[PDB]
Amino acid sequence: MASRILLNNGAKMPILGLGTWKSPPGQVTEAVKVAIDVGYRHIDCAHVYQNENEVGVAIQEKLREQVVKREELFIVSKLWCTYHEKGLVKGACQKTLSDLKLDYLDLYLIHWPTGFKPGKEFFPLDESGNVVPSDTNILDTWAAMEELVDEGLVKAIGISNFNHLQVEMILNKPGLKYKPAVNQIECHPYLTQEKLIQYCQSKGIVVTAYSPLGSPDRPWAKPEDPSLLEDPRIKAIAAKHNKTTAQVLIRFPMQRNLVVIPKSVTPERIAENFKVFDFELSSQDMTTLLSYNRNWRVCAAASCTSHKDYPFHEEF
C-alpha cells in the first residue's frame, strides 16, 4: 500500500491522517507533535473544533525543528456553516491560516452543505431550536472556494457531508472551474457508504472516511450504543492478523481506496494507529466487514433536519 493517493488537482494526499475534533486544547499540541514524530504527515482540522491555534503551535514547532518540511505536510481545514457567504469565505480561510500559522492549506473543505446565518454563534437558533439558515446556495459558496485556489491560499478544495445529488450539483455547476478533490464523509463498518463512495470514486473524487472508529467520544454517545472497538466479530479479525481492533478499523478504509483520519490524544494510540502499512485484510475480511453495515450514522444535527440542504434525507 502506497502512503499517498493522487488527487484530481495533481497533488498527493497521505491516506492516513490525524483527526483533531474533541482533542482538548491543552492536549492537542503534544498529540500533533507526537503524531509528526511517529510518521503522520496529514492533520485534519476545522475552525469549529476551536483548537486550530494549538494544532498550529505543534506544526510550527516541528517545521522549526526541521523534523519535516512544509511540502511534506498535508494540512486540511474546513469552512464552517456560518461563513458560506461570498464576502466571508476568504476571511474564514485567513483566520484558519493565521491560527495554524501557515501560508497555505493543502485542502480546504466546505464543512457541511448547510449554510447558517453569520454571526458569533456557530449554531444560530430560532426560539424553537431550529438552526437559522443562510440563503447562500452551495454553488455560490463553491465559486468562493475556487477563488481561494486562484489567490494561493489553498492548493485544493473539496466538500464534506455532501450527498450524491449535492456532489452532482457542483459537478454540473455552470462555469465550474475546479472540481471537488475530496468528499469527506462518515464511514465505518456500521455505515459503509457503498453507494456514495462508488459515485464519488466514479467521478475521480477521493473519499475521506471520518469517525472510522465510530467516534466513541462523541458528546451524544449513549451507554447502550453499538461499539465498533468492542464488536467481537471485528476483534476476531484483528486477533487473526495479530493487530488491534483499531488497526483493522483503520486498514479497512485504506483498502477501499479511501483516506482515513482516526483521532487520538493518547500518545501510545497515535503511534499504534499508524502501524497499519504492514498487513493486509483479505477480500473475505473486507466483504465480512462490509456486511456489518446497519446504516448507523453518528454525526448529524437535529437542529438542521429542516434546512433545505440537510444532506441525510436522501438515501445517499
Ligand X SMILES: O=C(O)COc1cc(F)ccc1C(=O)NCc1cccc(C(=O)O)c1
Quick check: 163 and 186 in contact, CB under 8 A? no
Minimum distance from residue 224 beta carbon to ligand NAP (Å):
17
Q: Of 226, 192, 225, 195, whose CA–CA distance to 209 is shortest?
A: 192
Q: Of 11, 16, 21, 20, whose CA–CA distance to 258 is shortest?
A: 16
Beta-bridged to residue 14, according to DSSP, are: 4
9, 51, 114, 161: which one binds ligand NAP (CB under 6 A): 161
| Identity of the residue numbered 24 | P
Does residue 246 have a known ligand-binding role? yes
Q: Is 76 in the site for ligand X (CB under 6 A)?
A: no
Complete DSSP assignment for 1-40:
--SEEE-TTS-EEESB-EE-TT--HHHHHHHHHHHHHTT-
Catalytic residue among 49, 190, 199, 210: 49
Q: Is 263 in the site for ligand NAP (CB under 6 A)?
A: yes
Minimum distance from residue 175 beta carbon to ligand X (Å):
26
- DSSP-assigned letter for residue 226: -
19, 56, 118, 124: which one binds ligand NAP (CB under 6 A): 19
18, 250, 254, 304: which one binds ligand X (CB under 6 A): 304
Helix (H, G, I), strand (E, B) or coil at 281: coil
Quick check: 16 and 42 in contact, CB under 8 A? yes
Q: Is 272 in the site for ligand NAP (CB under 6 A)?
A: yes
44, 54, 231, 309: which one binds ligand NAP (CB under 6 A): 44
Give the x/- contact pattern for ligand X in 38-67, rule: CB under 6 A: --------x-xx------------------
Does residue 22 have a known ligand-binding role? no
- DSSP-assigned letter for residue 155: S
User: Interface with ligand X by CB under 6 A: which range of 94-102, 236-244, 252-260, 298-306?
Assistant: 298-306
CA distances from 196 to 132, 161, 183, 215, 312 (A): 28, 11, 10, 20, 12
Q: Is 116 in the site for ligand NAP (CB under 6 A)?
A: no
Quick check: 246 and 213 in contact, CB under 8 A? yes
229, 286, 300, 301: which one binds ligand NAP (CB under 6 A): 229
Where in 127-156 is the site for ligand X (CB under 6 A)? Answer: none
49 labelled catalytic: yes
Number of residues that bind ligand NAP (CB under 6 A): 31
Q: Please list the active-site residues.
A: 49
Q: Site residues (CB under 6 A) for ligand NAP?
A: 19-22, 44, 111, 160-161, 184, 210-218, 229, 244, 246, 261-266, 269, 272-273, 299
